[PDB]
Amino acid sequence: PVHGVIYYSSPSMATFLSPAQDNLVRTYFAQHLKKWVVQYKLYRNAVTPKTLEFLKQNINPSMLACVDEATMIDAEPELEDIIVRTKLWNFRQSFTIEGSIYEVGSFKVAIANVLQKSVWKGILFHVTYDGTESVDLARPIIQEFFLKCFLQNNKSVTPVYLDSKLLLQLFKQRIDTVS
Amino acid sequence: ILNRLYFFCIQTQLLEVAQCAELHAVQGYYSFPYLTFSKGKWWVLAYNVESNSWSVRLLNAAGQTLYTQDVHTTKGTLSIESFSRLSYLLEVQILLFNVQTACAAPEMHLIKMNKTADLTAILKRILAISRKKXXXXXXXXXXXXXXXXXXXXXX
Amino acid sequence: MSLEEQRTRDELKHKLLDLNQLTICPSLLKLLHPETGTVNSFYTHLKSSNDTENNETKSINGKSAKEPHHSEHDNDNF
Amino acid sequence: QRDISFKFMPNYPWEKAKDFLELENSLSINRLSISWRIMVSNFEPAIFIQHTPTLHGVWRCKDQYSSNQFSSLKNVCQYIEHHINSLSRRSKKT
Amino acid sequence: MQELYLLGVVPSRRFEAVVNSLSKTLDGPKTILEFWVVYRPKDVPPNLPRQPDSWLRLCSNIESHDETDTEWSKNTQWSMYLEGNSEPKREDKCGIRPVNRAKLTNGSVTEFVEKMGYEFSHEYIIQGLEYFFFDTTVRIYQTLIPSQQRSIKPPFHPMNEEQPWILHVYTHVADASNQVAMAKAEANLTKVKTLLSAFCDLKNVRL
């Protein structure tokens, strides 16, 4: 279960890739980033940051992240949204990321266009493989086959490693979106 | 809805019959009723069934196509596809001979023998242009059977 | 005669080296001394943890993960 | 009918109960897996055959080659027939 | 989720008869034990609603969990509630208030209220029984004071020597907009009200 992730500057390639796909289609992965800032400054930072995000997960758990700066807490509600809605926390954008993991062969490809409400951000490919052995004897093998289909010129945060880890990584990747 | 069921159950049969020879039935071509099986483990040829009857339609695009009729063409299963493969690779070889004639037109030469069953309607020992089903004939007499095919060529 | 088939087993160890491309070889070599003294792609698809086997002169099972030189008694050299 | 070794491996929900209240819950919509370590080759490995009939809402083969998922038992039979055939051809390969 | 609460005092002098009655005319009893906690917001100036109901209420079933353990405070399951005020001038018919049943699952539980800046406030243990009636359900209250703060060791402290048992009929409307579902709910509670008025005196109460 060795996860992999890549950013790009080349929008709407996967839309052209799916017809080019030669293999099996499966569940359509999608998750939901959201901006959050406290309505008033007094929740400045640290213990009570203006930062917060709820990360909807269409895989299975539907367990929202409840992070006030490095404060993971899974929660199915949703109802917590409405609970937060009283007297707190302004909205502005979610720029949620739809996308559509597929089975292939030895390894599972995953795709997720970042369809911002603000037009667009950048494609975010994801990859998994049964790298049961040492990852560095496997990751280069993974990178052998981004050539098939071919991929070129990109931002490349692809950390070494079941999919739950991605949630922990989301904020880590959310940082890449801060700019 | 019942129409959907009749449409889908046949797929339920064939997919079980799809295990031998990975007929992934890739939908990257078309979702028309005729259906689109793929092949493995490898432009891409596309074996298919619909009438039901034996049929071949390599396409990308839409390339060379031809049909045959072995067996009842109703029930499977896997064994019948095992019959299919034998003639099928031979058909691919014939596609290769057509690649040759496309760029003499054409050689009377044929097999180039390969496995296995003689029950094929494809069929066997194809000559110039039209196939000459007479692989069973002696190689010296195969020229004579080919002459009989030439007699068929007159009409 | 048997030494050739054992050499084929050494070729299987070479296949384990191909898995390395994908120490134990020394102990496997000593096992080769012990033995001399006396489809698979689909197994890789199962890896796609795995198991496999090779006929003649005995049905050794080419289990792999590292590797497990299973064989048949039911002895299985490490 | 053709005499071939196999190993049926039952595990009923009601195998475990300490009272009728547990035996009551033994009967449920739960899947009931059943292993089937059929024995064919005296050399090549036995073909594991999972069987999981859900109550509502079945014959998962697994051999030396790759896993398979059926429904009709007859497909399982012919699936065995591919092995009694092609493996015999493998015996004929050398 | 718009809950439709009801209230009914039960003197302890006659409490057992009510139990023997309800058991013979309702589903259950199911055993009820739970440990409320309130974690207080502390911000100035207004507009903070800072309402007595605005104070948050985490909830946790504790009955199945063993008394001896002391690390239950996080290891136990938890949930979060708001419970807004009942709608104004609501009589005869049952009072109605919004409620939100949040849940959460992590090793970090209580800490989050501090992450919201909230701090410890009043807390109390509930014990009693619930009774099913299709959708509608009636729970009976005992608000025992814990022997120690965040402790689960009996005896727990009664508010008084003769604490009334606080009967509480309720049902949970999926959404206020559906007057149809409101009708079915008001109907069900009406039937319950008739069903147990013979040996108790329920009434609407403002909140």
XYZ file of C-alpha atoms in Angstrom:
713
model
C 0.000 0.000 0.000
C 2.656 2.507 -1.034
C 0.885 5.792 -1.722
C 2.037 8.322 -4.311
C 0.936 11.840 -5.295
C 1.758 14.358 -8.059
C 0.760 17.967 -8.879
C 0.658 19.468 -12.401
C 0.474 22.645 -14.491
C -1.385 20.906 -17.312
C -5.175 20.994 -16.707
C -7.660 18.473 -18.125
C -5.279 15.727 -19.213
C -7.103 12.955 -17.355
C -10.308 13.774 -19.195
C -8.373 12.907 -22.322
C -6.822 9.934 -20.554
C -9.967 8.096 -19.531
C -10.958 7.306 -23.129
C -7.320 6.299 -23.613
C -7.656 4.039 -20.606
C -7.448 0.363 -21.488
C -8.584 -1.147 -18.200
C -11.098 -1.389 -15.373
C -13.222 1.447 -13.963
C -14.302 1.439 -10.317
C -15.437 3.781 -7.511
C -15.282 7.510 -8.066
C -13.043 9.065 -5.446
C -13.880 12.580 -4.268
C -13.214 14.660 -1.150
C -13.930 18.157 0.065
C -11.501 20.830 1.266
C -13.098 23.894 2.870
C -11.842 27.301 3.948
C -12.538 28.337 7.547
C -11.767 31.464 9.558
C -13.210 32.524 12.901
C -15.684 35.400 12.641
C -13.678 37.314 15.219
C -9.953 37.586 15.843
C -10.003 36.357 19.441
C -9.459 32.810 18.271
C -6.049 33.996 17.107
C -3.811 30.944 16.858
C -2.189 27.939 18.546
C -4.794 26.484 20.898
C -7.601 28.251 19.014
C -6.486 28.996 15.433
C -8.638 30.721 12.843
C -7.565 27.725 10.764
C -9.919 24.765 10.370
C -10.906 22.256 7.707
C -13.443 19.482 7.425
C -12.422 16.750 5.021
C -15.332 14.766 3.658
C -14.368 11.278 2.540
C -16.407 9.527 -0.109
C -14.433 6.319 0.258
C -16.023 4.844 3.387
C -15.583 6.459 6.832
C -17.152 9.857 6.054
C -15.140 10.951 9.076
C -14.395 14.665 8.963
C -11.037 15.963 10.091
C -11.377 18.473 12.925
C -8.015 20.199 12.817
C -7.237 23.332 14.746
C -3.587 23.210 13.676
C -2.336 19.625 13.954
C -5.378 18.472 15.906
C -6.764 15.471 14.037
C -10.183 14.215 15.199
C -12.370 12.022 12.999
C -16.110 12.731 13.066
C -18.937 11.491 10.827
C -21.047 14.648 11.284
C -21.605 16.904 9.111
C -23.990 17.752 11.946
C -20.875 19.321 13.406
C -21.028 21.691 10.473
C -24.369 23.023 11.623
C -23.103 23.050 15.182
C -20.201 25.238 14.119
C -22.539 27.411 12.068
C -23.857 29.187 15.131
C -22.045 32.394 16.093
C -18.708 31.295 14.578
C -16.433 30.690 11.589
C -16.801 32.537 8.285
C -16.942 30.833 4.898
C -15.404 31.818 1.575
C -14.494 28.789 -0.568
C -14.187 25.003 -0.524
C -12.622 24.383 -3.954
C -13.440 20.687 -3.572
C -11.599 17.953 -5.443
C -13.672 15.492 -7.467
C -12.039 12.489 -9.078
C -12.264 8.449 -9.811
C -9.850 5.744 -8.709
C -9.432 2.786 -11.064
C -8.130 -0.752 -10.775
C -5.478 -1.562 -13.390
C -3.112 -4.452 -12.804
C -0.449 -4.841 -10.162
C -1.243 -1.354 -8.924
C -4.195 0.964 -8.458
C -4.187 4.257 -10.312
C -6.115 7.164 -8.810
C -7.211 10.455 -10.342
C -8.635 13.655 -8.886
C -9.046 16.929 -10.745
C -9.069 19.891 -8.374
C -12.214 21.494 -9.706
C -12.113 24.742 -7.778
C -15.188 26.905 -7.588
C -12.534 29.431 -8.543
C -12.239 27.892 -12.004
C -9.265 25.566 -11.514
C -6.117 24.771 -9.538
C -4.190 21.798 -10.887
C -4.528 18.079 -11.526
C -3.547 15.806 -8.650
C -2.746 12.245 -9.647
C -2.557 9.629 -6.928
C -1.022 6.155 -7.039
C -1.010 2.990 -4.944
C 0.833 -0.304 -5.219
C 1.448 -3.356 -3.053
C 4.979 -2.303 -2.159
C 5.162 -5.012 0.485
C 8.934 -5.020 0.073
C 11.211 -2.020 0.587
C 9.592 0.984 -1.050
C 12.750 2.238 -2.706
C 12.995 -1.044 -4.584
C 9.404 -0.415 -5.634
C 8.956 3.349 -6.027
C 11.395 3.610 -8.936
C 9.414 0.784 -10.540
C 6.356 2.952 -10.030
C 8.193 5.790 -11.722
C 9.131 3.559 -14.635
C 5.497 3.519 -15.661
C 4.467 7.138 -15.410
C 5.945 6.842 -18.874
C 2.982 4.642 -19.669
C 0.932 6.591 -20.119
C 3.627 9.266 -20.416
C 3.835 12.177 -17.983
C 6.102 15.254 -18.127
C 7.131 18.391 -16.205
C 5.525 18.561 -12.752
C 5.466 19.452 -9.080
C 6.180 16.175 -7.305
C 5.298 15.556 -3.671
C 5.279 11.748 -3.696
C 6.042 10.536 -0.148
C 6.602 6.911 0.777
C 3.864 5.097 2.684
C -4.879 1.766 4.312
C -5.878 4.835 2.327
C -6.575 6.622 5.615
C -3.039 7.978 5.625
C -4.119 10.283 2.824
C -6.248 12.224 5.268
C -3.219 12.871 7.417
C -1.473 13.916 4.248
C -4.278 16.185 3.060
C -3.388 19.096 5.308
C 0.221 18.380 4.467
C -0.780 18.833 0.858
C -3.136 21.637 1.785
C 0.037 23.571 2.527
C 0.989 23.287 -1.133
C -2.295 25.002 -1.901
C -1.684 27.829 0.595
C 0.166 29.870 -2.025
C -36.340 -2.656 -16.978
C -36.880 -6.248 -18.025
C -35.132 -5.325 -21.224
C -32.226 -4.197 -19.096
C -32.316 -7.536 -17.353
C -32.195 -9.502 -20.569
C -29.366 -7.255 -21.660
C -27.448 -7.654 -18.454
C -27.872 -11.328 -17.659
C -26.220 -12.332 -20.896
C -23.286 -10.248 -19.759
C -23.444 -12.093 -16.459
C -23.009 -15.309 -18.372
C -20.265 -14.091 -20.647
C -18.214 -12.463 -17.915
C -18.102 -15.817 -16.170
C -17.083 -17.120 -19.555
C -14.729 -14.134 -19.802
C -12.364 -15.531 -17.171
C -10.450 -17.705 -19.588
C -9.050 -15.262 -22.153
C -9.352 -11.918 -20.374
C -12.182 -10.519 -22.443
C -12.220 -7.323 -20.409
C -14.945 -6.026 -22.709
C -13.406 -2.564 -22.683
C -15.968 0.139 -23.378
C -13.401 2.503 -24.841
C -14.731 1.708 -28.291
C -18.527 1.770 -28.173
C -21.558 0.862 -26.061
C -23.647 -0.121 -29.065
C -25.680 -3.348 -28.708
C -23.165 -5.311 -30.768
C -20.816 -5.199 -27.722
C -17.034 -4.812 -27.501
C -14.856 -7.495 -25.890
C -11.115 -6.853 -25.695
C -8.297 -9.392 -25.430
C -5.180 -10.271 -23.442
C -2.533 -10.479 -22.525
C -1.693 -7.774 -25.047
C -4.608 -0.502 -32.472
C -5.913 -3.565 -30.598
C -7.987 -6.406 -32.060
C -11.517 -6.787 -30.704
C -13.238 -10.185 -30.634
C -17.055 -9.952 -30.333
C -20.440 -11.726 -30.168
C -23.928 -10.343 -30.865
C -26.194 -12.104 -33.363
C -25.228 -14.406 -31.668
C -22.609 -15.432 -34.223
C -18.831 -15.605 -34.521
C -17.396 -12.218 -35.434
C -14.203 -10.142 -35.620
C -13.933 -6.360 -35.868
C -10.502 -4.853 -35.256
C -11.010 -1.101 -35.037
C -9.878 2.272 -33.690
C -11.386 3.762 -36.106
C -12.888 0.740 -37.860
C -10.605 -1.732 -39.612
C -10.932 -5.101 -41.322
C -13.862 -7.227 -40.211
C -15.214 -10.711 -40.893
C -17.732 -13.176 -39.491
C -17.998 -16.941 -39.013
C -20.474 -19.531 -37.737
C -19.159 -22.434 -35.688
C -21.367 -24.399 -33.276
C -24.915 -23.328 -32.253
C -23.708 -19.862 -31.167
C -25.983 -19.867 -28.112
C -24.654 -21.338 -24.883
C -20.975 -21.075 -24.024
C -18.811 -21.568 -22.369
C -15.107 -21.271 -21.673
C -14.343 -24.352 -23.719
C -15.922 -22.756 -26.766
C -13.669 -19.742 -26.407
C -10.779 -22.174 -26.146
C -11.963 -23.336 -29.552
C -12.060 -19.698 -30.625
C -8.452 -18.922 -29.821
C -7.022 -21.593 -32.112
C -8.664 -20.251 -35.240
C -8.324 -16.708 -33.966
C -4.546 -16.510 -33.922
C -4.660 -17.971 -37.412
C -6.973 -15.141 -38.391
C -4.448 -12.674 -37.019
C -1.823 -14.371 -39.161
C -4.105 -13.923 -42.151
C -4.364 -10.262 -41.197
C -0.602 -10.288 -41.502
C -0.714 -11.852 -44.970
C -3.164 -9.130 -45.930
C -0.619 -6.656 -44.637
C 1.769 -8.267 -47.124
C -0.581 -8.135 -50.127
C -1.620 -4.578 -49.269
C 1.950 -3.524 -50.029
C 1.944 -8.936 -55.273
C -1.819 -9.269 -54.730
C -1.714 -12.011 -54.116
C 0.187 -15.079 -52.944
C -1.499 -18.469 -53.231
C 0.685 -19.550 -50.301
C -1.007 -20.436 -47.014
C 0.005 -22.325 -43.859
C 2.230 -21.573 -41.889
C 0.375 -24.156 -39.779
C -0.700 -23.491 -36.193
C -2.933 -24.986 -33.485
C -5.341 -26.599 -33.628
C -8.952 -27.626 -34.303
C -10.111 -28.064 -37.909
C -13.717 -27.137 -37.098
C -13.012 -23.461 -37.799
C -15.211 -21.514 -40.218
C -12.469 -18.886 -40.574
C -11.314 -21.324 -41.874
C -7.868 -22.578 -42.848
C -5.207 -22.435 -45.569
C -6.274 -19.018 -46.881
C -4.876 -18.082 -50.296
C -4.827 -14.830 -52.257
C -7.736 -12.578 -51.272
C -10.463 -15.066 -50.314
C -9.643 -17.906 -47.914
C -9.223 -21.423 -49.307
C -10.463 -23.875 -46.680
C -8.472 -26.998 -47.524
C -5.626 -27.387 -45.024
C -6.505 -31.086 -44.814
C -5.312 -31.574 -48.403
C -1.856 -32.921 -49.286
C 0.653 -30.159 -50.033
C 1.108 -31.301 -53.619
C -2.645 -31.745 -53.986
C -3.199 -28.501 -52.090
C -2.292 -26.749 -55.327
C -5.119 -28.697 -56.953
C -7.616 -27.841 -54.226
C -6.443 -24.268 -54.691
C -7.209 -24.763 -58.367
C -10.707 -25.772 -57.280
C -10.822 -22.529 -55.327
C -9.823 -20.884 -58.597
C -12.792 -22.639 -60.164
C -14.863 -20.975 -57.464
C -13.112 -17.709 -58.346
C -14.636 -17.822 -61.828
C -17.997 -17.157 -60.188
C 21.866 -35.955 -14.308
C 20.192 -34.530 -11.198
C 22.891 -31.857 -11.031
C 21.424 -30.245 -14.144
C 17.956 -29.975 -12.607
C 19.593 -28.611 -9.469
C 21.305 -26.087 -11.727
C 17.826 -25.215 -12.925
C 17.013 -24.695 -9.262
C 19.969 -22.341 -9.203
C 18.297 -20.624 -12.131
C 15.279 -20.339 -9.860
C 17.529 -18.677 -7.310
C 18.490 -16.388 -10.158
C 14.784 -15.753 -10.538
C 14.837 -14.769 -6.883
C 17.568 -12.360 -7.899
C 15.158 -11.102 -10.556
C 12.752 -10.573 -7.692
C 15.556 -8.601 -6.088
C 15.520 -6.577 -9.295
C 11.784 -6.332 -8.708
C 22.818 -13.675 2.075
C 19.783 -15.870 1.497
C 21.477 -16.910 -1.733
C 24.333 -18.352 0.312
C 22.111 -20.486 2.520
C 20.273 -21.410 -0.654
C 23.631 -22.431 -2.083
C 24.334 -24.656 0.898
C 20.878 -26.082 0.352
C 21.906 -26.640 -3.255
C 24.805 -28.639 -1.883
C 22.353 -30.560 0.278
C 20.180 -31.345 -2.739
C 23.036 -32.156 -5.102
C 24.216 -34.597 -2.439
C 21.039 -36.596 -3.049
C 1.983 -19.924 -15.142
C 4.735 -18.552 -12.928
C 3.856 -15.206 -14.443
C 0.413 -15.762 -12.983
C 2.068 -16.381 -9.626
C 3.601 -12.968 -10.111
C 0.074 -11.814 -10.847
C -0.842 -13.220 -7.453
C 2.015 -11.063 -6.208
C 0.356 -8.242 -8.138
C 3.122 -11.812 -1.228
C 3.026 -14.796 -3.573
C 3.452 -18.526 -4.095
C 4.674 -20.711 -6.959
C 6.084 -24.166 -7.654
C 8.357 -26.036 -10.062
C 8.079 -29.662 -11.183
C 10.950 -32.174 -11.445
C 12.557 -33.911 -9.933
C 10.486 -32.899 -6.925
C 7.624 -30.425 -6.637
C 9.500 -27.649 -4.884
C 7.298 -24.656 -4.151
C 8.904 -21.380 -5.189
C 7.277 -19.281 -2.486
C 8.473 -15.680 -2.377
C 7.868 -12.450 -0.469
C 12.666 -12.298 0.794
C 11.863 -15.854 -0.257
C 10.776 -19.229 1.091
C 12.335 -22.248 -0.593
C 9.446 -24.604 0.084
C 9.955 -28.164 -1.139
C 8.673 -31.731 -0.936
C 8.464 -35.178 2.862
C 7.566 -31.526 3.328
C 10.962 -29.991 4.076
C 11.333 -26.287 3.322
C 14.812 -24.764 3.375
C 15.030 -21.169 4.593
C -18.250 -39.417 -9.854
C -14.664 -39.218 -11.078
C -13.142 -39.828 -7.654
C -10.942 -36.895 -6.668
C -9.625 -35.993 -3.217
C -10.893 -32.870 -1.456
C -11.138 -31.327 2.002
C -14.483 -29.888 3.065
C -14.078 -27.320 5.860
C -17.370 -26.231 7.554
C -17.729 -23.455 10.117
C -21.383 -22.936 11.014
C -22.543 -19.936 13.074
C -24.293 -22.310 15.464
C -21.079 -24.233 16.119
C -20.643 -21.756 18.951
C -23.408 -21.116 21.464
C -23.668 -21.114 25.250
C -27.449 -20.775 25.353
C -30.503 -20.652 23.129
C -30.153 -16.869 23.073
C -26.870 -17.220 21.193
C -28.153 -20.059 19.031
C -31.038 -17.732 18.243
C -28.593 -15.234 16.803
C -26.656 -18.024 15.119
C -29.282 -17.866 12.400
C -28.674 -14.639 10.502
C -28.054 -12.873 7.169
C -24.326 -13.222 7.688
C -22.063 -14.699 5.045
C -21.112 -18.315 5.543
C -17.656 -18.974 4.127
C -16.671 -22.560 3.380
C -13.217 -23.649 2.309
C -12.749 -26.486 -0.176
C -9.151 -27.615 -0.380
C -9.638 -29.977 -3.287
C -6.692 -32.271 -3.968
C -5.731 -32.950 -7.571
C -2.040 -33.027 -8.458
C 0.243 -35.043 -6.216
C 2.846 -32.392 -6.955
C 1.159 -29.112 -7.859
C -0.660 -27.241 -5.044
C -4.288 -27.844 -4.101
C -6.775 -25.387 -5.571
C -8.403 -23.401 -2.778
C -12.119 -22.920 -3.353
C -13.840 -20.394 -1.126
C -17.630 -20.688 -0.904
C -19.610 -17.792 0.524
C -23.376 -17.949 0.034
C -24.863 -14.807 1.547
C -28.407 -15.267 2.831
C -29.563 -12.348 0.688
C -28.742 -8.889 -0.596
C -20.621 -17.763 -3.933
C -18.013 -19.996 -5.566
C -14.743 -18.096 -5.456
C -12.066 -20.257 -7.074
C -8.350 -19.831 -6.441
C -5.672 -21.923 -8.127
C -1.982 -21.892 -9.036
C -2.757 -19.296 -11.703
C -5.258 -16.716 -10.475
C -8.452 -16.171 -8.484
C -11.900 -16.428 -10.050
C -15.483 -15.579 -9.112
C -18.388 -17.681 -10.341
C -22.011 -18.437 -9.536
C -23.185 -21.671 -11.118
C -21.479 -24.768 -9.774
C -21.155 -26.079 -13.324
C -18.815 -23.233 -14.150
C -16.743 -24.370 -11.218
C -16.765 -27.855 -12.712
C -15.599 -26.773 -16.145
C -13.099 -24.554 -14.391
C -11.680 -27.707 -12.874
C -11.828 -29.188 -16.349
C -9.448 -26.513 -17.631
C -6.966 -27.798 -15.108
C -7.469 -31.503 -15.714
C -6.973 -30.596 -19.367
C -4.277 -27.929 -19.588
C -2.227 -29.302 -16.692
C -2.276 -32.681 -18.418
C -1.027 -30.863 -21.480
C 1.700 -29.442 -19.259
C 2.555 -33.017 -18.355
C 2.739 -33.629 -22.090
C 4.983 -30.596 -22.649
C 8.071 -32.563 -21.588
C -33.393 17.352 14.105
C -36.319 18.978 15.906
C -36.978 17.033 19.102
C -40.464 17.053 20.625
C -39.924 16.874 24.363
C -42.355 16.203 27.197
C -41.933 16.245 30.963
C -43.516 14.447 33.888
C -42.647 14.510 37.571
C -42.671 11.165 39.355
C -42.597 11.151 43.145
C -40.257 8.449 44.392
C -42.976 7.362 46.810
C -44.907 5.802 43.937
C -42.141 5.269 41.407
C -42.041 1.474 41.351
C -45.688 1.186 40.341
C -44.998 3.377 37.349
C -42.258 0.975 36.341
C -44.400 -2.103 36.695
C -47.029 -0.292 34.668
C -44.834 0.910 31.836
C -43.131 -2.445 31.476
C -46.510 -4.033 30.851
C -47.610 -1.433 28.300
C -44.408 -0.431 26.464
C -41.282 -1.712 24.708
C -38.146 -2.250 26.739
C -37.245 -1.360 29.431
C -33.762 -0.659 28.204
C -31.209 0.268 30.854
C -29.959 3.847 30.836
C -26.775 5.272 32.292
C -24.813 8.214 30.947
C -22.282 10.865 31.941
C -22.988 14.405 30.740
C -20.290 17.033 30.481
C -20.521 20.747 29.753
C -17.529 22.685 28.456
C -17.923 26.426 28.760
C -17.273 29.104 26.134
C -15.443 32.105 27.571
C -15.280 35.064 25.196
C -16.006 38.786 25.508
C -17.530 41.191 24.175
C -21.030 40.419 22.839
C -22.484 39.427 20.554
C -21.859 36.120 22.238
C -25.231 34.427 22.648
C -23.705 32.997 25.865
C -27.099 31.429 26.532
C -27.563 28.807 29.275
C -28.370 26.300 26.523
C -25.586 27.700 24.332
C -23.086 26.039 26.644
C -22.095 22.855 24.849
C -23.022 19.401 26.104
C -20.880 16.389 25.326
C -22.552 13.058 26.019
C -21.301 9.540 26.614
C -22.868 6.166 27.313
C -21.029 4.663 30.249
C -23.169 1.779 31.453
C -21.572 -1.064 29.505
C -18.165 0.301 30.410
C -16.812 -1.058 33.703
C -16.727 1.142 36.820
C -13.175 0.253 37.843
C -11.502 1.922 34.874
C -10.272 5.505 35.217
C -9.175 6.085 31.621
C -12.765 5.930 30.417
C -12.682 9.714 30.128
C -11.384 9.456 26.565
C -11.537 5.756 25.702
C -15.320 5.768 26.076
C -17.566 6.720 23.150
C -18.592 10.377 22.927
C -21.036 12.726 21.237
C -21.989 16.394 21.191
C -25.265 18.288 21.538
C -26.617 21.811 21.367
C -30.340 21.741 22.136
C -31.687 25.177 21.288
C -34.595 26.843 23.065
C -38.189 25.712 22.627
C -40.398 27.834 20.390
C -42.199 30.719 22.193
C -45.691 30.490 23.704
C -45.925 26.774 23.004
C -48.612 25.210 25.189
C -51.076 22.317 25.143
C -49.098 20.793 22.322
C -45.595 19.631 23.186
C -42.723 22.090 23.158
C -40.294 21.706 20.280
C -36.571 22.410 20.138
C -33.721 21.884 17.644
C -31.139 19.231 18.563
C -27.951 18.050 16.850
C -26.420 14.655 17.611
C -22.746 15.034 16.702
C -20.328 12.124 17.076
C -16.561 11.708 16.913
C -13.835 9.067 16.988
C -10.206 9.671 17.917
C -7.850 9.357 20.877
C -8.205 13.119 21.177
C -11.659 13.737 22.605
C -12.110 16.207 25.452
C -9.082 18.175 24.355
C -10.959 19.648 21.444
C -13.166 21.810 23.617
C -9.992 23.492 24.802
C -9.008 23.651 21.145
C -12.181 25.679 20.800
C -11.013 27.499 23.902
C -13.840 25.994 25.914
C -13.211 24.930 29.513
C -14.823 22.669 32.123
C -18.291 23.550 33.390
C -21.144 21.838 35.244
C -21.716 18.111 34.791
C -24.081 15.380 35.973
C -24.838 11.672 35.610
C -28.139 10.376 34.236
C -29.686 7.029 35.096
C -33.058 5.468 34.302
C -34.846 3.536 31.562
C -35.953 4.032 27.977
C -39.117 2.736 26.363
C -39.565 2.343 22.620
C -42.744 3.119 20.737
C -41.964 2.842 17.044
C -40.352 6.188 16.310
C -41.213 7.883 19.586
C -39.377 7.023 22.770
C -39.717 7.878 26.440
C -36.754 8.092 28.808
C -36.960 8.550 32.587
C -34.398 10.713 34.427
C -32.224 10.563 37.536
C -29.598 13.319 37.660
C -27.070 11.786 40.064
C -24.017 13.815 41.069
C -20.782 11.863 40.498
C -18.889 10.812 43.627
C -15.872 12.697 42.273
C -15.326 14.835 39.188
C -15.082 12.520 36.184
C -15.367 9.488 38.449
C -17.546 6.449 37.884
C -17.552 4.956 41.367
C -20.866 4.366 43.232
C -22.531 5.730 45.341
C -23.246 8.773 43.214
C -24.751 11.776 44.966
C -28.493 12.503 44.756
C -29.504 16.162 44.565
C -31.788 15.408 47.514
C -33.034 12.610 49.743
C -36.172 12.246 47.629
C -35.226 13.017 44.045
C -38.192 13.025 41.679
C -37.924 10.715 38.670
C -38.064 12.974 35.640
C -40.128 11.314 32.916
C -39.370 12.570 29.415
C -41.293 11.622 26.285
C -39.661 12.655 23.017
C -39.333 12.039 19.298
C -36.925 13.277 16.648
C -38.306 15.032 13.584
C -35.941 14.687 10.634
C -36.646 18.283 9.596
C -38.960 21.141 10.573
C -40.061 21.904 7.010
C -42.108 18.708 6.704
C -45.483 19.472 8.292
C -46.508 16.001 7.152
C -43.869 14.348 9.307
C -44.780 16.909 11.945
C -48.324 15.614 11.748
C -47.316 11.992 12.056
C -45.083 12.866 14.994
C -47.616 14.990 16.845
C -50.038 12.154 16.276
C -47.728 9.518 17.707
C -46.931 11.597 20.761
C -50.604 12.324 21.166
C -51.310 8.609 21.251
C -48.520 8.101 23.774
C -49.908 10.919 25.864
C -53.274 9.239 25.920
C -51.595 5.913 26.530
C -49.926 6.891 29.793
C -52.011 9.803 31.080
C -53.978 7.259 33.103
C -51.206 7.011 35.704
C -49.182 10.169 35.112
C -49.608 13.882 34.440
C -47.456 15.052 31.534
C -47.458 18.673 30.418
C -45.672 21.028 28.046
C -42.881 23.025 29.696
C -41.078 26.054 28.286
C -37.363 25.788 27.505
